[PDB]
């Protein structure tokens with residue numbers, strides 16, 4: 001890992017091992033190869049609604065503070081569209097009163113709520129990068145596989161569609177440019193990098209708990 005090439009590159013390299021671990025978790029691997037089904041995908045999306053809700057509250061806090069404002073684009077917010085997807089997948093709003101956070105999600109949500117409470121800009125950016133750039137990347141493959149293997153209606157995959165964003169690759173390139181332009185102290189940078197690994201660790205455990 002190097003830091004002489006900018007934060008975007010340092011992040012990518014520093015978290016590469018943790019990304020591989022999350023991406024290849026047994027649950028996700030089985031889901032994408034067609035071994036599971038829409039029920040398991042819905043369970044994942046229910047857990048995701050819980051942590052996206054926490055994430056987006058933290059994003060609102062940090063954006064309001066003035067830190068990384070241009071990076072924290074509200075067009076990225078997923079909680080509302082995800083709730084609409086869940087309404088479709090489950091057939092009603094029943095899920096809202098039924099779902100419960102897995103142990104993994106309890107931990108993940110707790111950390112996001114701590115970031116929100118502390119208004120910890122560097123830590124929030126780490127979590128924002130891990131989730132949203134993942135959605136704009138691997139997420140696109142997930143959406144296609146839900147349609148292909150399980151026949152999920154595209155209208156129940158709004159989470160992955162990012163209404164309001166035109167060119168996707170251009171958007172990611174601009175996102176990385178914004179990361180590179182963030183004014184961070186060495187301590188803040190170190191904190192952001194460590195947190196990004198922790199974000200991937202939380203995500204792997206979410207998949208593990210779904211697999212149980």
Ligand code: HEM
Pocket residue numbers: 008011012019022023024028129130131133134135136137138139141142200203204
């Ligand atoms: C919760 C799980 C996941 C998270 C958090 C995550 C996160 C990320 C992030 C943050 C990037 C951006 C890397 C960068 O340019 O700095 C990324 C890229 C990518 N991810 Fe993952 N990812 C996950 C799951 C997956 C899955 C399951 C796959 C396999 C479909 C995948 C395939 C890719 C690919 C191929 C890229 C490169 C960019 C692209 O081709 O669109 N990811 N992911």
Ligand SMILES: OC[C@H]1O[C@@](CO)(O[C@H]2O[C@H](CO)[C@@H](O)[C@H](O)[C@H]2O)[C@@H](O)[C@@H]1O
Pocket residue numbers: 012013015016017018019020
């Ligand atoms: O590309 C996403 C992400 O995957 C990592 C491992 O987490 O790299 C692997 O996948 C790449 C293709 O997507 C390969 O080019 C690479 O050689 C392989 O290790 C990360 O480095 C990368 O950001």
